[PDB]
Design a protein around this ligand. Sequence first.
Ligand SMILES: [Mg+2]
Ligand SMILES: [Mg+2]
Ligand SMILES: [Mg+2]
Ligand SMILES: [Mg+2]
Ligand SMILES: [Mg+2]
Ligand SMILES: [Mg+2]
Ligand SMILES: [Mg+2]
Ligand SMILES: [Mg+2]
Ligand SMILES: [Mg+2]
Ligand SMILES: [Mg+2]
Ligand SMILES: [Mg+2]
Ligand SMILES: [Mg+2]
Ligand SMILES: [Mg+2]
Ligand SMILES: [Mg+2]
Ligand SMILES: [Mg+2]
Ligand SMILES: [Mg+2]
Ligand SMILES: [Mg+2]
Ligand SMILES: [Mg+2]
Lengths: 155, 82, 97, 95, 116, 127, 54, 100
Amino acid sequence: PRRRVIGQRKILPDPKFGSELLAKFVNILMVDGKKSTAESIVYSALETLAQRSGKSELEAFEVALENVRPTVEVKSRRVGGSTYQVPVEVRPVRRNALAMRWIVEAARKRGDKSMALRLANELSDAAENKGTAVKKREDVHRMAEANKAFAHYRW
Amino acid sequence: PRSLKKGPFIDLHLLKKVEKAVESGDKKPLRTWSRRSTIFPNMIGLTIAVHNGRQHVPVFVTDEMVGHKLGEFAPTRTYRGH
Amino acid sequence: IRIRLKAFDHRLIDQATAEIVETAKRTGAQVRGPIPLPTRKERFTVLISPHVNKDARDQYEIRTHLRLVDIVEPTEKTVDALMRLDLAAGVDVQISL
Amino acid sequence: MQLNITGNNVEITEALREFVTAKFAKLEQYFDRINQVYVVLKVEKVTHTSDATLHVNGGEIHASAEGQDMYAAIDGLIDKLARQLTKHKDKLKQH
Amino acid sequence: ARIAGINIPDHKHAVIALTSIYGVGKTRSKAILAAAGIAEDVKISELSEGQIDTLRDEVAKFVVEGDLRREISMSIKRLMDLGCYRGLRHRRGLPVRGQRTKTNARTRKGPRKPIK
Amino acid sequence: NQYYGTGRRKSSAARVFIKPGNGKIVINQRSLEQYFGRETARMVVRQPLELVDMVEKLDLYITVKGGGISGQAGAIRHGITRALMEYDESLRSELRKAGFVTRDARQVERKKVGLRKARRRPQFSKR
Amino acid sequence: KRQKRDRLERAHQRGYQAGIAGRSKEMCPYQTLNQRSQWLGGWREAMADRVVMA
Amino acid sequence: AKQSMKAREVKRVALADKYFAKRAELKAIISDVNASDEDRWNAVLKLQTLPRDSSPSRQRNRCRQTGRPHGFLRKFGLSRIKVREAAMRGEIPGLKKASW
RNA sequence: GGCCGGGAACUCAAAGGAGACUGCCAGUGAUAAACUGGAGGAAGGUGGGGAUGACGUCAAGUCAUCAUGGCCCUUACGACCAGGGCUACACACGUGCUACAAUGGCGCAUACAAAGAGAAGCGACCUCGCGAGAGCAAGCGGACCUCAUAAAGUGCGUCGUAGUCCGGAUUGGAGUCUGCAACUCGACUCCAUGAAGUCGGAAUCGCUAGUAAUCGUGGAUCAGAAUGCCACGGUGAAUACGU
Ligand SMILES: [Mg+2]
Ligand SMILES: [Mg+2]
Ligand SMILES: [Mg+2]
Ligand SMILES: [Mg+2]
Ligand SMILES: [Mg+2]
Ligand SMILES: [Mg+2]
Ligand SMILES: [Mg+2]
Ligand SMILES: [Mg+2]
Ligand SMILES: [Mg+2]
Ligand SMILES: [Mg+2]
Ligand SMILES: [Mg+2]
Ligand SMILES: [Mg+2]
Ligand SMILES: [Mg+2]
Ligand SMILES: [Mg+2]
Ligand SMILES: [Mg+2]
Ligand SMILES: [Mg+2]
Ligand SMILES: [Mg+2]
Ligand SMILES: [Mg+2]
């Protein structure tokens, strides 16, 4: 908005692994206010991530997260009749939000039986540069790389 | 529909004037606005011309018409199509 | 004996109480504390236009106030007096043995 | 361009309907992306009036005109919308 | 897995499977599998010919398939030939139970017939 | 010598009594793990203790009436943080920095005329 | 929405934008010498960038 | 409201609470499962005979000031309009604008 | 079994008070007004929500709430009654509800609210009935009695991605209740039936926090007739770089 929004909220950390990061991840998966339902789905995925990578949970779920965070996004800007896509840095907190969103979005768009399966598989595939989630980031990065010339406009 | 315990509903006026039809054998059609009234067995055999809103229309009563309510045989709207 | 006091004004009711819990003290008796009770709030919504304009309303309300007072050890004297009292108009009382 | 006609104190016959439809068919040449549009005709004492409202691709255009007849009212109205539609187009095809 | 002269799914819980019979819903399905003391969770494939018959017997208690379809069709023919308001609703193919037609009513009327 | 708080969140009210002991909890004649299925709830109830490691050095006793789960759970936490900084006027500053001492206030907004909810307003399509 | 944005930063970006769009210094709306310095500061930074734009 | 329409409401009240008992007991036998088929059948003919306007379902609450048939309130016996008009003078004890 | 004697602490009820004022402290600022930050504090800068709508605009809306200038009708444009109509259906548009499933359907088991209504009205317990309901009849003009068991949630089981154990429109049969009376034209119940629909072109709307989303509850009108309206709590997000 035109002024500055004052007062950032407080995400309580996860009941289990006590992370504000994972707590955010739940909210993002959560639907229609059903926080418990989402709390389940999340843990059951990490189980099944842990049970194959054998690399902890709050340290495995991360590795997915790194394969998929973007570092440069594009903003659109109307110039003459045309619209300039222009590359910009991404804020740390934003690239968390995007990674967590793209992971969820990619999960749902699958044919597996449970939600938990979809999440698990997706997080695993993420860790080995594979799924739609990670495809998306690649594409984002391709576009910002393409129209790099418009890096330094301020317009 | 009407509770079973309260019996079948007929307007009295019309109930009466299908004794004189059935006892004192006539053969005329009867006028009536009594679209409420259900058709009783006695009514079998007698044409009775029930009101539809503007006109009375004849209903030659039969075995099959028993329990239904007169007005269920006098359509009240006209429609051919568009 | 219990008396329940009920009214629309709150200043008004907090009179009758004090009036009664003065007499009760007077005509020798113990009066078990004026205890206030939940106040009912009937509410009303009404269209304020005389035609059309559904989304234009007023919201009215009537707050009823209830008070209860007891009579511990009813003196013979009191029963007459607490019965015979001309009490502020717009206040219902319900002495009941 | 989907059309709709009202009459507030006017009976829409099948000249006034046919007439109004033909006159409105022009407007699409001024801006191709017209959607549904509502027309209203009035007679108050001696004043003949005609307003329409036009849902367009990113906008809402409205005008009303007064004639001594309703035909002359609608004739006037079509000249008003023409100008507004052209203005709209030109601040999209703005290169 | 042939009951009432139709094939019943043999990989479905009896309860669910028996519903394929036209004229049995779910209430009847439950009854059958108790009147003919057969469990509910049992799949039809894992039964005995014997079990399937005592079952075949229960179903005969009702009026079902062919039989039923005939009954219904009589009832509707009956109405149309009577010519009662309810009859014509059936003829003209319109909501028989008082539902609005100015709008909606597309299940009787079927998909739209444009103008002109 | 038992120390007391009241505690409120949304529509909940939680009267609590703490005593020195080994770390028992009762809510409405019931145990913690029974009364509160949800895990979140538990975390919330004990996090004032988990802060000032008296988790098993004091024994708590509670009742709650009104609200739902996250309401009661929340209301209790406030109840503790009140008592726990009354047994010890010392801890306040630490408790306060965690932001447990403030009473939340956030209540559900009323429904208003013309709206489907508090702020949701009926559609009108320019389509 | 709850609190007004930094006045100095805004003043510096208003300066930049009049700069790039090619208005004259002495359109500057500030006499508060503090905000004024921000405005011109932007306006002169922008004068550099125009050159390498078309 | 037309004077006539106000009037019918008086004709209708008066009857309703004159044949009130006759209807009640004459109904009471109808709904009696454990009664004479002879009795109940008579009753059905007897109830339909005594006059329509004598039924309580036949009447319509109209503002007892202007006669309006719509937007009535029981607590006051007035239409929404007249309720508001009087509210604002303070002719309705207690009543006043509300906020929460 | 707050069940009993007690207790007046606590929760709560409602009258009366206390409290927040840029008051206190830094830095900026024209020795201003203010600003940005800090302290304490339940609350911090209009703390949150409501009520409150300037002079005027649109010959905007209402002569069908009422009133009223004028004009018109007066064995009829007034009055009474029965039946019908406002519920019609090639079609077009607007506002909603329920869906299309597995963050889900079904069965068993089991937690935690708020606000409101009741007088000839709210109607328990008991008996009957698969059920809507019926009969009998306690208590309550109500912080006491009754409506009236919150639901989502939670555990255990099952269905295994199917036009399906998804959906529940449509229609036949069989009932109940309100009411002189439910054919046209009521609500509900049981048995059977089991449609379109696999997340919706161009366009387009709502919302910045206890908000949206989602889940239940009550009321006014009212003999009977809510998916609407007005209220009430439960769970409870997302994101604001910026102009
Ligand atoms: Mg009450
Ligand atoms: Mg012309
Ligand atoms: Mg069924
Ligand atoms: Mg509306
Ligand atoms: Mg809500
Ligand atoms: Mg008059
Ligand atoms: Mg009525
Ligand atoms: Mg501060
Ligand atoms: Mg003011
Ligand atoms: Mg006008
Ligand atoms: Mg009539
Ligand atoms: Mg209508
Ligand atoms: Mg919906
Ligand atoms: Mg189903
Ligand atoms: Mg009611
Ligand atoms: Mg029973
Ligand atoms: Mg806003
Ligand atoms: Mg709802």
